[PDB]
Amino acid sequence: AFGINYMGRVSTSANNDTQKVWIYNGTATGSNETVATIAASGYFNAFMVNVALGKGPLGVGDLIIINGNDASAFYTVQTITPNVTVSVF
Amino acid sequence: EGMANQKAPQDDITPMNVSNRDAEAVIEDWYASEYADRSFQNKLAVNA
CB B4 within 8 A of CB B14: no
State how far the Cα of B46 lies from the Cα of B40, in Å rounded to an integer: 10
Nearest-5° Cα angle at A7, A53 to A81: 15
Element (H, E) at A37: helix A35-38
Choose among A52, A32, A44, A49: nearest CA to A78: A44
* B12 chain-A contacts, CB cut-off 8 A: 12-14
* B11 chain-A contacts, CB cut-off 8 A: 13-15
E strand residue ranges, A1-89:
7-9, 21-24, 63-67, 72-79, 85-88
CB A25 within 8 A of CB A6: yes
State how far the Cα of A79 lies from the Cα of A69, in Å rounded to an integer: 25
Using CA atoms, how far residue A70 sits from A32, A59, A66, B39, B47, in Å, is: 9, 26, 11, 104, 101
User: What resolution in Å is listed for this PDB structure?
Assistant: 2.1
Number of H helices, E strands in chain B: 0, 0
User: Does A11 contact B at CB distance below 8 Å?
Assistant: no
State how far the Cα of B47 lies from the Cα of B29, in Å rounded to an integer: 28
Using CA atoms, how far residue A56 sits from A37, A50, A88, B39, in Å, is: 21, 7, 21, 105
State how far the Cα of B35 lies from the Cα of B48, in Å rounded to an integer: 9
